[PDB]
Amino acid sequence: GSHSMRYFFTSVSRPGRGEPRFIAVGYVDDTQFVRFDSDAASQRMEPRAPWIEQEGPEYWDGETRKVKAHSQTHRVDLGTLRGYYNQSEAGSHTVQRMYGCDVGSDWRFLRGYHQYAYDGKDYIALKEDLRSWTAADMAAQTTKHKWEAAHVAEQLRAYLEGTCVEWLRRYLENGKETLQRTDAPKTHMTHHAVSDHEATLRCWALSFYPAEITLTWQRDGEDQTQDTELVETRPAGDGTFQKWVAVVVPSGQEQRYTCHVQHEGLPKPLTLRWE
Amino acid sequence: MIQRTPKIQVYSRHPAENGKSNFLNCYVSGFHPSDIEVDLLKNGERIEKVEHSDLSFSKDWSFYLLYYTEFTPTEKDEYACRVNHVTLSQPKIVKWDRDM
Amino acid sequence: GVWIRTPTA
Secondary structure, eight states: OOEEEEEEEEEEOOSSSSSOEEEEEEEETTEEEEEEETTSSSOSOEEOSGGGGGSOHHHHHHHHHHHHHHHHHHHHHHHHHHHHTTOOSSSOOEEEEEEEEEEOTTOOEEEEEEEEEETTEEEEEEOTTSSSEEEOSHHHHHHHHHHHHTTHHHHHHHIIIIIHHHHHHHHHHHTHHHHTOOBOOEEEEEEEEOSSSEEEEEEEEEEEBSSOOEEEEEETTEEEOTTEEEOOOEEOSSSOEEEEEEEEEETTOGGGEEEEEEOTTOSSOEEEOOO | OOOBOOEEEEEESSOOOTTSOEEEEEEEEEEBSSOOEEEEEETTEEOSSOEEOOOEEOTTSOEEEEEEEEEOOOSSOOEEEEEEOTTOSSOEEEEOOSOO | OOOSOOOOO
16 A cells, blocks of 8 residues: 655753753654654664664664754744744743655655644645745744745755655565554444443444544444544554444344444455344 | 643553453543643552653644553453643543443 | 754744
8 A cells, every 4th residue: 555654743842941852753654663752861763663673873873863953953943933923931832843755555756745833833834746835924934935045845855755755665675574564453343231222332443554444334224423423543552553433323223233344454344233 | 822632542452351461541632732641540549650652743733642551450440541731620530441 | 764954944
């Protein structure tokens, strides 16, 4: 299938004392493979998947240097944006950055992205053509002009369409045993009698990878949305994911309802029904 | 700033059986700012050896964290997740439900 | 691997 490499960066200023809390996480698809945490002792980019440990000392020195460069930029930005928004020095603020690249089944470049937020709101983002910027407000507009004059988009494009795609392909190969393995959901259904006339059917999907999945209820062969509940997909903690969907039904009518499961790891969609 | 209240899910990694080692998870998501307090409770008492994932966020910028600990479920032990956040006037407690 | 540049805002 298609694949992605994504990096997520968060800095939170500490007005009370010291430098911002800085946390970087790297993903291939839904697999975290590196992290940097300013609160950790190592002060190094650290491995979080076995297949990245194949990389030698030069890799780790380079990623450490570069991710520390990210943290300093974030620190400087927190100061700059505080001024742009005329904010006090007393408050804590947050900067968030995410960027990365998608490749298709053929591992050819598909898309690139780079977005930036201040205090949880869009600040500036690279457009889909990777040639121009979306600035949410007049502060971000100042940044946009600065980045245009310095041709940041062009430099970013060289990474996103070039180096980023080459890294992703390197990782997919090195980690193929897991990265290219699909874990179909382990499914089952539970039954809970809430009262004497209603029952809840819950359709479970467990231990699947990647995270993308569709759970739908049908009644007599038609999609049921009324009286259903779907939880957000959640990590199992072992690299796989979980999800469930439930429907309230009249007692004795359970047989009418079917749960339908779609996942890349499934050759055909699954259908479950309480009988 | 923006303030988004955390969604809380409390659950075991594996279907729970008494006497069989497992992992107790508290998944908090959809919140902002990232500053958050999360405790896992055993019969109302705070569990000390709890770890958490590295802070990350969704496309809409909202943060998520997995808090977890090893545990062995039993008949009468009760487990819960306790969360505090700027959006909450008091700590929100969510009980682990074997099924729900 | 992360981006080699990190322009300030």
